[PDB]
Write a protein that binds this ligand. Structure first.
Ligand code: HEM
Ligand code: HEM
Ligand SMILES: N=C(N)SCCc1ccc(CCSC(=N)N)cc1
Ligand SMILES: N=C(N)SCCc1ccc(CCSC(=N)N)cc1
Ligand SMILES: C[C@H](O)[C@H](O)[C@H]1CNc2nc(N)[nH]c(=O)c2N1
Ligand SMILES: C[C@H](O)[C@H](O)[C@H]1CNc2nc(N)[nH]c(=O)c2N1
Ligand SMILES: [Zn+2]
Lengths: 416, 414
């Protein structure tokens, strides 16, 4: 039949063909010889620092494709404005080597980038994104102001709103605008004498970096790290987020009264700050974006991963489970309660959150929408299926095709 | 290039060089990844009415023979040289060849070892191989299958086994076991499209009935086998009840669980896959091991398109099924898997939970890294259907590719 990947849902027995992948312009890490789909960072997308200006020919092509996408989205392909805009970009790249996006083009691209994110399960919200333009930002201090406004607007006292702030694009031979921290909010990770870690092991390097740069460290398990902001060609400056702006939620269990005595907690705003936003060839090295948490991110990965807070054993001991034998499923039990505690605490504190069931169901709806609107949807199965109760959610039974579409959010090397 | 493989829990890194030995193409291409897909668009195993290209076959044959003699440290030896000459002599004159029992045994084990979707390959070296190539009828197939079942079951102390029927032959029909497993519970369609029993077995249940089987009306009615000898209509055979060991399900603390009347069989044995060794194809080669609890507790009993018992268990547990956020599904799932483990251990029947199982697979990855320079694994199938990140394999990157000997899917005979 159709000359495109046949995709099946084994629960409902339904079939679809992905024709959108034909639009992919960039190769992933797989080949007919072997599948590398489970690799977190295959060295492909990896936007490695490419200092010297990019091949005008290369950029022009990416730029024309994007502009075509833009005019198509407003239903004006082939129009005079479309052709003139095309001429304008080529002219500009011709005389300066690069070009700039109009306001509405940036907004469209930011949303398309989210829309094209293979690893995001919250894409049903893609059309609703507050885009803060900060391409005028000229200092590390101004980056801090912008970021604070982002946090304030997105947190909105617990009624979270998706948002993104776009700082100046990478320029010919000039320094990049960078946010060193992987997220706007991160708990410190203190390397101990015995070799262990206090706080979040995931943040040991950035914590040591903040210290090397003048931050006086605390000794808690949930210390909010300061931000290391870097304006072009300048060393990074240290900024401490005003406590009132970082909304947190103490964690308690709905029936296990002792859980609250554990003193656990998590922050409300999930905001990635280390990714690169690419649109029509243009590269925005600093463009933090945020939505709202899916309970398993906090309850399963952050709190239960071996290399994170690793609280599984502590919680099992409290539930008086048999932690000496795997077959007691003590790990599974503690994990469920820990996750329930996150959903409970967030609801109580009236902070936005979505469980893995609700989330995946909404993603199934998103897949339907996209099948009709674009003939497919790039999705990374391993990342879409939740870390717990995998086959209990609908996405587990849904085959998925993964591929790279631009605009996109890509990983980028650490500035240090 | 050789892929860098990382374990995000430990920080350890390795390089898979084994993938370089892959000679068969997968579904992926640089433009898009199709690793989450269950079946090949065609990778399958097309008909065999004509002889396979002498060149190709001979190529796969030499490779396999080389593999074998290497395994017994007798490479380049006299036997190795003469064995190669035999194979060539036979292919050249008949367009095919046959394997020696020892080679077949080596092939079966290698196929299991190369199976990317198998999480219990640490056991790959311990496999009882029943040579059934001297089988000429459905009736004989049935006797072989009964012995395999008696042996494998071993009164609850399961032993991994495989039975190999005649290889496919040019222009002649294949020997085939129509059922997907040697033990399957009937799935009866009735009234309003609903199904009594196992929905996954509706079609096969219907084929059996059409071939004279007197259907039952239960949720767990053990189906009969439809064994097919070359170019002949399949034959119906009922398995002796005392042979099909089953485990009644109860819960360690929840008294009411047993009242649900749930049960599952002890022997997981695939009988619809094809075994390929050195170019030769074995369309009927049933193999069995022992169950990992999540297969029964999570997929078979909880899949929405299977027994789908989640809600029932939830209501019995008096959970809040009004909303997703109460995690009633996750809670019932855990109790159901516990019950499965409890019940099998009570019945003294082999079973492995998903934690122990994935821990052993990790040791296997290590054993293989040192033994072959890598290990083909399918991450989507290796990670358990519940508590994914709570097991070590979730945090382990994997490379997937096709090595031979190999187990492959093949078209349904009807
Ligand atoms: C509205 C709520 C949203 C939810 C519930 C949601 C949920 C998720 C989840 C569960 C992940 C995986 C997190 C992990 O495993 O570490 C993710 C990844 C991702 N999301 Fe969304 N998302 C939302 C909003 C957004 C927004 C606004 C953007 C972009 C403008 C976005 C872009 C991405 C990207 C690019 C990734 C992958 C990043 C990486 O590879 O580390 N998401 N999202
Ligand atoms: C000793 C105990 C064994 C255990 C615990 C084990 C476990 C598993 C599990 C959990 C799966 C996935 C099942 C599913 O989700 O449907 C699997 C798949 C598979 N196993 Fe093993 N296995 C064992 C023995 C064997 C043996 C003896 C063979 C063959 C000689 C084998 C061949 C395979 C193959 C080919 C697959 C993929 C089947 C398919 O794609 O349908 N396994 N195994
Ligand atoms: N994840 C959500 N529920 S809202 C979307 C914004 C967001 C995406 C991904 C992460 C995980 C860290 S991945 C990284 N920092 N590159 C955190 C925050
Ligand atoms: N599964 C084990 N624990 S032992 C290995 C033998 C085995 C593998 C897979 C299945 C499931 C059906 S897959 C299919 N029929 N192709 C059944 C039996
Ligand atoms: C090795 C493996 O790719 C890795 O552990 C992946 C699996 N799936 C994931 N899925 C999500 N959402 N987030 C992750 O960080 C991961 N990690
Ligand atoms: C669509 C998706 O590939 C499918 O549901 C897969 C996922 N992982 C699996 N893993 C195992 N072990 N067994 C399966 O049947 C599946 N099904
Ligand atoms: Zn792939």
């Amino acid at each position: 039949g159709p000359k495109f990947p046949r995709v099946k849902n084994w629960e409902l027995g339904s079939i679809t063909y992905d024709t959108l992948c034909a639009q992919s312009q960039q190769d992933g890490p797989c080949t007919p010889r072997r599948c590398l789909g489970s690799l977190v960072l295959p060295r492909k997308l990896q936007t490695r620092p490419s200092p010297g200006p990019p091949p005008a020919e290369q950029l022009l092509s990416q730029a024309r494709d994007f502009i075509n996408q833009y005019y198509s989205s407003i239903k004006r392909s082939g129009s005079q404005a479309h052709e003139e805009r095309l001429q304008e970009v080529e002219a500009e790249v011709a005389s300066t080597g690069t070009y700039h996006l109009r306001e509405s083009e940036l907004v469209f691209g930011a949303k398309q980038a989210w829309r094209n994110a293979p690893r995001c399960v919250g894409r049903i919200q893609w059309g609703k994104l507050q885009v803060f333009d900060a391409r005028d930002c000229s200092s590390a201090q101004e980056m801090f102001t912008y970021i604070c406004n982002h946090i304030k607007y997105a947190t909105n006292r617990g009624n979270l709103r998706s948002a993104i702030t776009v700082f100046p694009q990478r320029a010919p031979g000039r320094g990049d605008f960078r946010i060193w921290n992987s997220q706007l909010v991160r708990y410190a990770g203190y390397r101990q004498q015995d070799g262990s870690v206090r706080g979040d092991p995931a943040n040991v390097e950035i914590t040591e970096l903040c210290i090397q740069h003048g931050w006086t460290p605390g000794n808690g398990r949930f210390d909010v790290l300061p931000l290391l902001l870097q304006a072009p060609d300048e060393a990074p400056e240290l900024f401490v987020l005003p406590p009132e702006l970082v909304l947190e939620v103490p964690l308690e269990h709905p029936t296990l009264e002792w859980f609250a005595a554990l003193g656990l907690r998590w922050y409300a705003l999930p905001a990635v700050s280390n990714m690169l936003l690419e649109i029509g060839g243009l590269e925005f090295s600093a463009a933090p974006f945020s939505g709202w948490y899916m309970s398993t991110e906090i309850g399963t990965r952050n709190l239960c991963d071996p290399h994170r807070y690793n609280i599984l054993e502590d919680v099992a001991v409290c539930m008086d489970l048999d932690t000496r034998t795997t077959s007691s499923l003590w790990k599974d039990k503690a994990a469920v309660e820990i996750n329930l505690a996150v959903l409970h605490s967030f609801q109580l504190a009236k902070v936005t959150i979505v469980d893995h069931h609700a989330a995946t169901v909404s993603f199934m709806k998103h897949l339907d929408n996209e099948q009709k609107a674009r003939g497919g949807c790039p999705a990374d199965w391993a990342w879409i299926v939740p870390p717990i109760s995998g086959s209990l959610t609908p996405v587990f039974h849904q085959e998925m095709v993964n591929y790279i579409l631009s605009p996109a959010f890509r990983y980028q090397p650490d500035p240090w």
